[PDB]
Symmetry: C3
Subunit: 307 residues, 3 copies
Amino acid sequence: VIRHFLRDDDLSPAEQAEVLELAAELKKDPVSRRPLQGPRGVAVIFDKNSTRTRFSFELGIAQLGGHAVVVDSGSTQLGRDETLQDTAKVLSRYVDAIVWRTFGQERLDAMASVATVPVINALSDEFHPCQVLADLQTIAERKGALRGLRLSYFGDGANNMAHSLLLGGVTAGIHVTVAAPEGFLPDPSVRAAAERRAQDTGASVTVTADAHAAAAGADVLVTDTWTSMGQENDGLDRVKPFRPFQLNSRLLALADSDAIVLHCLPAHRGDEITDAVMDGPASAVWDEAENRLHAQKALLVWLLERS
Amino acid sequence: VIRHFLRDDDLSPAEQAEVLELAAELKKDPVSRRPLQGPRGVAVIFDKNSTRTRFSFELGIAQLGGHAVVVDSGSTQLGRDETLQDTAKVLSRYVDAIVWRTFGQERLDAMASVATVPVINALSDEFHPCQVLADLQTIAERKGALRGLRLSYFGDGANNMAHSLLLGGVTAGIHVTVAAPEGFLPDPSVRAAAERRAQDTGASVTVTADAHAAAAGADVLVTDTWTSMGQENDGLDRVKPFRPFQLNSRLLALADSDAIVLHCLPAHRGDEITDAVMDGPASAVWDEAENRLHAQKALLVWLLERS
Amino acid sequence: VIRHFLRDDDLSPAEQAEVLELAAELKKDPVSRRPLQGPRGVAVIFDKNSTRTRFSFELGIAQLGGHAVVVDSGSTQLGRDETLQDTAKVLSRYVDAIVWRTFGQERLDAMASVATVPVINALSDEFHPCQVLADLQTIAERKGALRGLRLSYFGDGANNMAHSLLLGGVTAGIHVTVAAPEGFLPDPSVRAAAERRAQDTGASVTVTADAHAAAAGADVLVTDTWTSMGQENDGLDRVKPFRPFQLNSRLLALADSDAIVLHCLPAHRGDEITDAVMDGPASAVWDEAENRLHAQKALLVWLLERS
Ligand SMILES: CCC[C@H](N)C(=O)O
Ligand SMILES: CCC[C@H](N)C(=O)O
Ligand SMILES: CCC[C@H](N)C(=O)O
């Protein structure tokens, strides 16, 4: 019955494609779709920091005719231990969708399990699915057909972006490669889900510790922070392992000539990515960030007309 | 000139009836009254946690045509000791009403003493009058006439809910009973005010330490947390005295067969209310929370046309 | 191309009069200009506490038909060290202007250097130009023309208000005097720029340690806090030096008989300004606060049609 979006494969390949096509339509006509007219509300809850997600969601919602109630969960009664399920049943009386940036996926599942409106993952510890929709809209407007392109991700292969690039990348027909060192590879379960979905789309999943091989011939190079939110006090050395995986000019010179570079941001310039690459001719980082707005609006128009 | 809503008896019986009738009408047509179109502003200021108050005011104001400016007081100049009177005088220059969730009642009185727009209590240590209007709206849509109903509240009978249920209840013509251990009875001057208001409406006020007597034949049964915001560090055991006052199936079984159960939320499941009661057939808990939206809109409309 | 408002002299004198003429028209017809209709977004970012700037900007954007995204910067990725240039380039994809209350002026220069939308100083350690636009509107509406009035500022002559009164005063043709102890004097390059602007408008700049001589004959007396945000820990006694500079009944008695008193707020009553003055017949303080709303809206309309 009600459609949620907690992870990238919650959209079938055909569904993802309808979303991305609508994304491109909304980018060209931003304020003419008003499913939340009223204004109907949408909850937008943050447990972690945000710039791109906060702005793109709040504005998108307003552009759909609705009203984002944007909160830090700590100042809600979640900070005083109201259960996630009571919260979600309450929010279901006020809003038409619940967008949440959180820690463990289990938290999203708890709310999704009783909510009577779409729950949307605005970033968890294990996935960042709205980002990869914006990533894919950006690749599509630059390259055309998504099916059969090669995309390589570099760095922490166990974080939310690695995971979502895998699931959303194969959902789109894309051969995805994760280049990561050995403490830091995708979760087996996510890798299994990606392989499962790739079978239906013609895609493939490669996981390697050879950055040079991952880069070579690639159509899209992607990276992300070596230390994500939640990982600060994990005690690991998060510099030494990742140095070989830095997205720099040696690396990019191995890719296909028309290759593009993505980074979800915020970037720690000099670490995972260098200035010359980020501010170079291949970077699509600013268009990528912008698409957060157009992609999430499409997602929401699509989820709402199905719920 | 100027009507504030700082505690429940700030409305007369006839006025409360006007507000509740309008609450009913706005539930039916939520966007048909737009007295704040423009948008005009309303200030919504939080010194404490919230989910239901935050969402229902922010959205209810937007559906009245207006725009809520929602802030934690700690990031305003209130956090650098600007006085409450200066703050109120300045806010009366931007917004058409000031909604404030705070501690001592005296702080609301300080703002209401100089403000030139309605000040509205969105919870204080002593009263929670917007909650009780939602309660009454939910009672009325389930049972019809309010006059003559029998309501009992259980638990911490010294808290804002107990005071507000006593005052809003008897204003509605409802026989109110507060059932609580000896060390947590209503403030006697609140209780006296309630007895005075009861003489006008045919209501009554009862304070009891016997839960079973309070449940017997009750039409509505209400409870709330046993540790309110601001009580966390009073050092008292706030489980043991309250156990006999728990709202569970055996207590509920004593009530009228058509009795309903209310809880303002957030609930501590297994303490003041059991899963079995809260999720049972008698529970009006979620309609109650929805009715915050409607009741506060009605309240806003009424106050604005009188100020 | 694109006009920023980082400091008062960013407007030439003809441009400032355009903005203030607009302010007065918008005070009379507040929803008559909708350039942000859509809604288009505007970033409103806080590094420091705020009441007046928060409410005036948020509501004023809404009244121009747009949507303000209001954030404390600690919650954004600025809190996790994303560079200002990256933040600005990203915001430029989402919003139509960036309003920022911050610390060093160089942070605003950093953003404005790469931003493709107008950056607007909602207060920095150096300037507070939007406040002075509201100050000028409130003088104009009480005294008529601005050219050739006498304005005196008292207290910390090196703070952001001293600098804006200097630059925005002379730009309006106002003879500006700063009365401050000798260790608290306007930054030399701000005084120079003010002297240079005064030559084009026929105004003048005076700086003195003599509070009595500064009050004698003044049309406008202005003060501000002795310890601004950010100065709490400089090690200075910030009471003893400024006592001779207190805006009290004695000093007001020296002014022109039709003099007005202004104070940006928040006020530490009993320090820089007394109750008798603040609350007496010369005080234009509440109207001054309200005019933040009208003056910022005009500035936004004006900047947007030129960017
Ligand atoms: C947009 C932030 C993504 C990053 N992997 C994190 O969780 O911090
Ligand atoms: C709505 C919360 C009510 C509770 N008595 C409290 O003040 O915390
Ligand atoms: C509006 C505040 C003005 C003061 N100079 C400060 O910087 O704190």
